[PDB]
From Swiss-Prot:
It comes from the Eukaryota. A zinc finger (RING-type) spans 22-83. It is found in: Cytoplasm; Nucleus. The gene is DTX2. Signal peptide: none annotated. Belongs to the Deltex family. Regulator of Notch signaling, a signaling pathway involved in cell-cell communications that regulates a broad spectrum of cell-fate determinations. Probably acts both as a positive and negative regulator of Notch, depending on the developmental and cell context. Mediates the antineural activity of Notch, possibly by inhibiting the transcriptional activation mediated by MATCH1. Functions as a ubiquitin ligase protein in vitro, suggesting that it may regulate the Notch pathway via some ubiquitin ligase activity. This is Probable E3 ubiquitin-protein ligase DTX2. Homodimer. May form a heterodimer with other members of the Deltex family. Interacts with NOTCH1. The WWE domains are thought to mediate some protein-protein interaction, and are frequently found in ubiquitin ligases. The chain holds residues 391 to 617 of 622 of the full protein.
Length: 227
């Protein structure tokens, strides 16, 4: 869908604008969109105002359009105030593969069950239209990347949700490495994984009693919920 149709699809226009601020541009809703000076459109003027259809938060429609055009344009929208997701949120994960293995040995802190191994393999390539620099190379460092879950009821639920996030292209993105500063490289995208069975190697791994709770919250923040 066209960007302006996304905004209209998920908003109900307000006849008279309230006094409160648009928190995207921090101008009153009754005045022109604060991003009217750098955002052009066809069917959305600088005065148009609406509220999202599920959380009733209100914005200049032209600010919502500018927000949407700064992200990847997959037809989904996320409310900047309450983070409610409209449509199916997807991401810019490059092509690769995701392999799942299991073994009977226990992770530290999960002596009562076996272990799930997830192996992600993403090669280098050419950036697509959704990426920072379309048509330019991107690198991919340190693949295959191996990740571990306990093979209990909660870990198996995380596994199934990770498969959804993978299908929605949400696990990796192309950006700059927080570790090395390198730009235009494949990096993790907001869903943290355990890459060490033993946290003594790097400081991060198992045991970690809060990990499954925390990764479930990260999946949910990206619209990947138990439903
Ligand atoms: Zn605004
Ligand atoms: Zn909202």
């Amino acid at each position: 869908p066209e960007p302006e149709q996304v905004i209209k699809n998920y908003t109900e226009e307000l006849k008279v604008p309230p006094d409160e601020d648009c928190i995207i541009c921090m101008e009153k809703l009754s005045t022109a969109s604060g991003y009217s000076d750098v955002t052009d459109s066809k069917a959305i003027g600088s005065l148009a105002v609406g509220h999202l259809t599920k959380c009733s938060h209100a914005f200049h429609l032209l600010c919502l359009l500018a927000m949407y055009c700064n992200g990847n344009k997959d037809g989904s929208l996320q409310c900047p105030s309450c983070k409610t997701i409209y449509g199916e949120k997807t991401g810019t994960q490059p092509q690769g593969k995701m392999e799942v293995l299991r073994f009977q040995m226990s992770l530290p802190g999960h002596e009562d069950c076996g272990t799930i191994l997830i192996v992600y393999s993403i090669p280098h390539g050419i950036q697509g239209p959704e990426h920072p620099n379309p048509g330019k190379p991107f690198t991919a460092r340190g693949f295959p990347r191996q990740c571990y879950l306990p093979d209990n009821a909660q870990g198996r639920k995380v596994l199934e949700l990770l498969k959804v996030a993978w299908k929605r292209r949400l696990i990796f993105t192309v950006g700059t490495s927080s570790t090395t500063g390198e730009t235009d490289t494949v990096v993790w995208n907001e869903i943290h994984h355990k890459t060490e069975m033993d946290r003594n190697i790097t400081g991060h791994g198992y045991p970690d009693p809060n990990y499954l709770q925390n990764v479930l919250a990260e999946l949910a923040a990206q619209g990947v919920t138990e439903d």
